[PDB]
Amino acid sequence: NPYARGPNPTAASLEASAGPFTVRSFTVSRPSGYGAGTVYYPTNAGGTVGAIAILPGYTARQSSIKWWGPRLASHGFVVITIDTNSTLDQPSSRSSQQMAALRQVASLNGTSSSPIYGKVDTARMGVMGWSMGGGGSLISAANNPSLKAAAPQAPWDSSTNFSSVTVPTLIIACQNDSIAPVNSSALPIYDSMSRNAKQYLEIKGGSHSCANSGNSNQALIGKKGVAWMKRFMDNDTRYSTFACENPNSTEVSRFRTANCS
């Protein structure tokens, strides 16, 4: 497998705060088609790696989703955390900006002055995001089926019907979410998808921000997020168990998965 990177995973290696690779970051000097961006990248991944673009929620900024940057990049991904043109952007606009960020990561991969020069496999990209940014990620996957993976958290969109999505999608949900309640948002979105590998991971007792920076379940959520991205962005079957298993965690109130061996 030409995309396989890093050592064979264990629960401990996936639950740790950082993966095997050293991480550096830089601010995007002139963001093209979005508000602002921070790029996290591994210095020593051993090959080109996929790129992941992460959206914040309504009124929110990069701080809410920043922890994913070092966490994912330390396992061999280039990750751009996004500020949208307006904090009040709706999910459709949020999706366009997510793709613009992936577009600029690919452009920067071909820029000699950039720290990620030569570091990205621009054919392998994924999307993540919180709430409206989760709906934005789902729209990105629907419109761009070549995306290799999606992992929105506490998603919300004006529609819950994402039946066209063929991208492997992990729905991270928060049980006690009062902003985007699971019964009217995360669950129907999960249920709508009939054509893909998919998973529903509900954090017990979680408020709307249960997967944000500073959360108390970074070991569990970080493991699932990284494992899902490894399995599907890298086709890495060393991660099939971690990606598709019920994690048997006291912090999970609900678990569902389909087309996930």
Swiss-Prot record:
It is found in: Secreted. Changing residue 210 to A: Displays decreased enzymatic activity on PET film and on BHET. GO terms for molecular function: acetylesterase activity; carboxylic ester hydrolase activity. Optimum pH is 9 for PET film hydrolysis. Optimum pH is 9 for PET (commercial drinking bottle) hydrolysis. Optimum pH is 6.5-8.0 for BHET hydrolysis. Optimum pH is 8.0 for the hydrolysis of pNP-esters. The enzyme is active at pH 6-10, has an optimal pH range of 7-9 and it is rapidly inactivated below pH 7.0 or above pH 9.0. Pathway: Xenobiotic degradation. Its EC number is 3.1.1.101. Salts and glycerol enhance the enzymatic activity in vitro towards pNP-esters, while detergents and organic solvents reduce the enzymatic activity. Optimum temperature is 40 degrees Celsius for PET film hydrolysis. Optimum temperature is 30 degrees Celsius for PET (commercial drinking bottle) hydrolysis and BHET hydrolysis. Optimum temperature is 35-45 degrees Celsius for the hydrolysis of pNP-esters. Remains active even at 65 degrees Celsius (about 60% of maximum activity). It catalyses: (ethylene terephthalate)(n) + H2O = (ethylene terephthalate)(n-1) + 4-[(2-hydroxyethoxy)carbonyl]benzoate + H(+); (2,5-ethylene furandicarboxylate)(n) + 2 H2O = (2,5-ethylene furandicarboxylate)(n-1) + 2,5-dicarboxyfuran + ethylene glycol + 2 H(+); an acetyl ester + H2O = an aliphatic alcohol + acetate + H(+); a butanoate ester + H2O = an aliphatic alcohol + butanoate + H(+). Keywords: Disulfide bond, Hydrolase, Secreted, Serine esterase, Signal. It holds the Pfam family PETase. Induction: Highly up-regulated during growth on PET film. Changing residue 132 to A: Displays decreased enzymatic activity on PET bottle and on BHET. Changing residue 156 to A: Exhibits highly impaired PET degradation capacity relative to wild-type PETase. Also displays decreased enzymatic activity on BHET. It comes from the Bacteria. Changing residue 64 to M: Increases activity towards 1-naphthyl butyrate. GO terms for biological process: xenobiotic catabolic process. Changing residue 157 to H: Displays increased thermostability and increased PET degradation activity by 14-fold at 40 degrees Celsius. Poly(ethylene terephthalate) binds at residues 58, 132, 156. Belongs to the AB hydrolase superfamily. PETase retains the ancestral alpha/beta-hydrolase fold but exhibits a more open active-site cleft than homologous cutinases. Monomer. This is Poly(ethylene terephthalate) hydrolase.
